[PDB]
Amino acid sequence: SKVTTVVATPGQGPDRPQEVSYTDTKVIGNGSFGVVYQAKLCDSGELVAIKKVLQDKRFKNRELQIMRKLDHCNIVRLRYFFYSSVYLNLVLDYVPETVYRVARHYSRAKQTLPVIYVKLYMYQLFRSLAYIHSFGICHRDIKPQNLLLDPDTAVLKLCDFGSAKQLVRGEPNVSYICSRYYRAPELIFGATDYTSSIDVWSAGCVLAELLLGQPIFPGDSGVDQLVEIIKVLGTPTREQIREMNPFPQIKAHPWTKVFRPRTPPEAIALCSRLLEYTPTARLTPLEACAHSFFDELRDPNVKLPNGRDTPALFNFTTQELSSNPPLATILIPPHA
Numbered sequence: 622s623k624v625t626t627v628v629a630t631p632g633q634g635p636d637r638p639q640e641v642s643y644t645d646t647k648v649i650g651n652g653s654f655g656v657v658y659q660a661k662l663c664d665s666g667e668l669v670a671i672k673k674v675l676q677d678k679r680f681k682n683r684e685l686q687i688m689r690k691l692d693h694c695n696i697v698r699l700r701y702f703f704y705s706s707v708y709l710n711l712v713l714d715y716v717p718e719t720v721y722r723v724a725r726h727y728s729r730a731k732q733t734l735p736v737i738y739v740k741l742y743m744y745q746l747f748r749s750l751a752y753i754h755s756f757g758i759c760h761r762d763i764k765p766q767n768l769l770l771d772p773d774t775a776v777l778k779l780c781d782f783g784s785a786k787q788l789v790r791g792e793p794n795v796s797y798i799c800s801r802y803y804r805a806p807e808l809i810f811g812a813t814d815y816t817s818s819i820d821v822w823s824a825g826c827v828l829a830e831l832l833l834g835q836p837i838f839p840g841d842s843g844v845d846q847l848v849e850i851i852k853v854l855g856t857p858t859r860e861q862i863r864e865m866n867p868f869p870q871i872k873a874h875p876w877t878k879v880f881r882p883r884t885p886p887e888a889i890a891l892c893s894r895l896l897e898y899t900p901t902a903r904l905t906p907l908e909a910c911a912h913s914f915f916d917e918l919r920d921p922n923v924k925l926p927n928g929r930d931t932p933a934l935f936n937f938t939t940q941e942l943s944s945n946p947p948l949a950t951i952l953i954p955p956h957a
């Protein structure tokens with residue numbers, strides 16, 4: 622079995638390369654960005670994913686620089702990085718599943734994911750967003766494929782920071798980020814002055830899709846997407862439009878009627894508050910963690926269906942809570 626030994630730089634703390642050996646390298650992904658390999662570290666037998674991307678000669682890699690700053694239980698960990706022949710290689714913790722793959726399994730068994738998992742996956746996503754947003758970092762590509770899962774522990778890790786950017790007021794940013802189905806209306810309308818609330822919309826779309834078993838705003842064009850949105854939210858008022866920034870006439874489909882009939886009311890209430898036209902009316906991620914849909918996760922007796930304890934849910938930091946420190950009394954329950 623072929624070993625690769627490289628001199629790699631730890632992702633966090635002090636810039637101090639060490640020699641790293643790995644084996645059992647195989648391709649696991651292959652989109653636009655480049656390649657993802659899986660490999661096994663010789664020293665520890667730990668499995669890693671290596672995201673290999675072509676490195677611009679001019680610039681510093683933005684994805685890399687954002688990942689070196691991030692340290693959160695619901696975000697994939699940058700273990701090391703190195704250069705090879707010129708390519709940047711991101712050595713990441715290996716995570717075996719994704720929300721996309723798990724959802725599609727229930728979907729084709731004509732079944733929906735049990736709500737305990739909807740609760741767990743969505744809360745952990747909202748945590749990861751609370752954390753990056755506190756740095757003014759917007760992910761800009763929230764979608765089921767980017768939500769990795771460990772099915773055994775029910776841990777969710779956000780990944781793919783290839784579109785992520787710090788958003789600064791008064792700076793314009795490209796409106797062509799983010800994947801179809803998950804794109805906030807302001808993005809569809811071509812705003813360049815959007816905020817981090819675009820992630821919130823994208824998160825509301827994942828929530829709705831886990832509840833429905835299929836995407837809620839599908840469409841091969843902007844127009845078709847907008848019609849699906851209008852069909853649920855009703856036509857946007859002129860003030861709502863000006864708020865998204867840059868003309869069919871439908872009344873709102875009552876959110877209870879959108880979903881199958883045994884759908885928990887707090888689940889629907891949470892969607893209606895994420896999927897708002899006006900970007901400033903959307904819940905923040907921290908507010909979303911504190912919503913009553915997630916109350917069962919705050920129950921001292923909650924367990925995973927495999928009989929394990931829930932994963933880490935309450936270890937908030939001052940950084941993570943900073944958008945609204947008083948939510949801590951809701952978020953960290955008596956027993957935690």
Ligand SMILES: Nc1nccc(-c2cc3c([nH]2)[C@@H](CCF)CNC3=O)n1
Pocket residue numbers: 649650652654657670672697713714715716717718766767769780781782783
């Ligand atoms: N299995 C596993 N484990 C850790 C990280 C990854 C991973 C990183 C990235 C991907 N997978 C895919 C996810 C989007 F489709 C592509 N881009 C990434 O950054 N995959």
